[PDB]
Design a protein around this nucleic acid. Sequence first.
RNA 1: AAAGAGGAGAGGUA
Lengths: 49, 620, 97, 98, 89
Amino acid sequence: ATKDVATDLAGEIRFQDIVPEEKTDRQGNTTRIAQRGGLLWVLAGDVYN
Amino acid sequence: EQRFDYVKIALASPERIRQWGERTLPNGQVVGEVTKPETINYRTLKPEMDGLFCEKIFGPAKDWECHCGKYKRVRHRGIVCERCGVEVTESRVRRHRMGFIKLAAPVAHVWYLKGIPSYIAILLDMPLRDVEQIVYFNSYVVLNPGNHSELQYKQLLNEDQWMEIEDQIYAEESDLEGIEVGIGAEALQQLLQDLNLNEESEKLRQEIAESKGQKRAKLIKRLRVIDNFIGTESRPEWMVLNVIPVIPPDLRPMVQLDGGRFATSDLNDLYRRVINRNNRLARLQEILAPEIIVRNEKRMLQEAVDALIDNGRRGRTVVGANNRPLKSLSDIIEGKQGRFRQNLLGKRVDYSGRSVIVVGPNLKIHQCGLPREMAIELFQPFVIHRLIKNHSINNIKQAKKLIQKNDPLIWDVLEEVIEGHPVMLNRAPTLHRLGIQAFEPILVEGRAIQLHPLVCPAFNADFDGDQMAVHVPLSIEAQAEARMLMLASGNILSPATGQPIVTPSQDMVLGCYYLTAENPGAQKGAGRYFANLEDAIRAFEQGSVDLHAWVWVRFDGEVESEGESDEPESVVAADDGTVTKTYRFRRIRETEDGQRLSQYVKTTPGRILFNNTVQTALIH
Amino acid sequence: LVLLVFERAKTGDIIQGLPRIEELLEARKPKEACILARRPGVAHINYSDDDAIDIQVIEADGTQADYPVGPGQPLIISDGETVDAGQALTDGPANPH
Amino acid sequence: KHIEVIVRQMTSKVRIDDGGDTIMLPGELHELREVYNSNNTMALTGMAPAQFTPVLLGITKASLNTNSFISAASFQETTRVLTEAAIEGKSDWLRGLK
Amino acid sequence: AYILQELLTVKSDDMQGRNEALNAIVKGKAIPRPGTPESFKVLMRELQSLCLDIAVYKASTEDYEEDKEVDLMADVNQRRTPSRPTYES
RNA sequence: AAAGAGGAGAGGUA
Ligand SMILES: Nc1ccn([C@@H]2O[C@H](COP(=O)(O)OP(=O)(O)OP(=O)(O)O)[C@@H](O)[C@H]2O)c(=O)n1
Ligand SMILES: [Mg+2]
Ligand SMILES: [Zn+2]
């Protein structure tokens, strides 16, 4: 089973101990998997699009 | 001994199909071919002369009476009336006799064309799409390449391409006189008639060795089929139909309800459609119609035959009055409601009953209670026989009148007819072999069946709305089997695990628990001494002792207690070489390294009652 | 931000027990298990960097086998243990085919 | 005992590979004892025997490979079974219940 | 086995055995042996209607003589077969 | 002598 995680803030992103990993399929698409989990920090700010 | 030894199935040739439904008459004519979509006359309810219900083909509709009403009676043993051709015999012959229909054009059997393996496609070494396109008039096929350079044997063509080749050949030129035979039609009988089985078998066997992988396996499959057609000596072209059998008319009844109208049967509609299309195609072919209208009729005839055999297998489904598909021949033998799983592996039976169950105490474990209204109906022939033999009445009619009038004597006869005759009882979900059991019946007054409480867990039944079914054996062998194999007093252990199955269940357990429990309160008469196990019971019935008091009783035998100490709590040695050993629940007197002299047990009157009941039950 | 992947929690009870019996009696393919394919009988766990566990099974003649382990496959053996042909290594329902 | 009786019916066949000269085409399922007896009889003269591989069938695949078409037709897939039996010209000797 | 056989044939659809059993019970004699149920014959006719050649055969006891087909839809005994059981006389 | 034929929907009881 799967569950999405959303954010209630808006700002910059920082990684503490998460270690990303890149995997590819047989069609050329790439997806990123967290090899080592940890904490993901969102720092407040005003975001302009 | 036995009439037959084994059953065999094979493919059917047109000769065998014709032989099934053809019979001759002492005139020189032959009958058996149906040529009209007519069933019966609307004015007088009699069958027509050459339709689906004809009497010359299938047989007379009344016993020993021909169609024109001129020969009757039974003294004739198989003569045929020489004005209408109807044989004079019983109407039971309408359950066996078959007919046949001769088709204007050949059609393909849908079972051998649309299947998980396709046998026509495998035999012809062609994909299923090409074979399906040759049939149903969607493409042409080259049956003979001739002296051409691009054409190949068994090559799919099209209308435009055939037009181009036709222009080339019909240009009155040379080098093209190779007799190109491209026929877009059924055209499968010709391709199947050109097969040589032995040469292809040798070629495939030679080619198998020099191959590997999925290429080999495919060839192997083909080889299999080919060798089959050599073992059975069948012809591969028999998969294309020229004659069609017709089922006896008594298996598709018409039924005369509706006051003025008639009932609906689905096989008759399909047969009528097939006959109509065949007649139209024959008439069109007779007068030399243009060959663009004939192919239409051929296609509709093929579709009609396909719908008759298996509805919805290939294309659209035939729909009756409401948008509900009709029932074909393959829908009668197919599923849970088909012939196999409904009429052959299970049946309805005679001499059976059903009713609600109540609880009967004071019964024996091999006994049941039957209401009189059910019993007087389930045992009628035996009662009639005993009324004729003893208490000589006269004949059967007088006995039936006596039974209907409800004379008091019939009950006296029935009370002794049923004595010694077992009966079988069943509950609806039969999960194991203990769901059917045999009992001995006794007559009761009421409308409910009485059941012994000790057999409820095996049936999984309680008295809040359940119902049971009753069956009666007839022959002596069945009665012996019921008595010696299924009687309810001999089913003690479980076939799944060798554990007891007739243990006391709900209130007997509570009573036995209350009888033998402990009660620090209500200790009246405690400490008394008794001899025998009967003195304690007799004192209890007088009210002089309570039920849970602690008393000493003189008992010689093996005794087990709860928490008894194996070590002698007290030992007292007296003169003349005697010793008294006192335990928690016992007191034993012994001589000098010898035998016992007395033993007393400290117990409760209810435990004495329980053990005395058990001991007494094992001696009777 | 992310999409967590996990295993849902269910009850016991007979409704969840019969499907395993039906799967067993029909000889169908499970979704786990790693099976050793040769006799030898000397296994070295060889804990590598970034948690890349690779079991190495060493024969008496010097063969290596080199079975790799997945990210979420628990181990049911120890280091320096003796193993047999067809014996499971990393838990789960074995494939009988 | 019951589980052993059930399990025995699904672990007692073998798939034939390149049968030498006997009547055994590759891709067929045969009892192990029958193949053993046939090989024992055939190798007495000294010809080439057949190869095989054990298989594990399943409760419903093993019951559709019986020797009688009548019992298989009354279980499942009536039309396919009857078509194959008619093509092969099979016969039924009426052994066992059902 | 005898209970099952009597349930399947005499009590359901053996059109000739029903009357024999009833009259044997009434007269107090033994019940004669059964024959072939009607549903099997109905199934055979339905299968033959699909252009399938299915029949029952009798094994050849001796000699080279081939096995002979048996006609199931034929009368063996010269006795009546009414639709419902009745008390004769 | 005679006497019920199937089918399709909807609702209940173990
Ligand atoms: N779909 C169903 C429903 C009921 N049953 C039968 O009917 C029983 C139901 O018994 P019931 O009296 O309704 O309930 P119990 O479980 O016996 O409980 P209680 O009598 O105490 O209410 C089942 O065990 C089973 O034998 C069944 O076979 N199929
Ligand atoms: Mg209940
Ligand atoms: Zn006449």
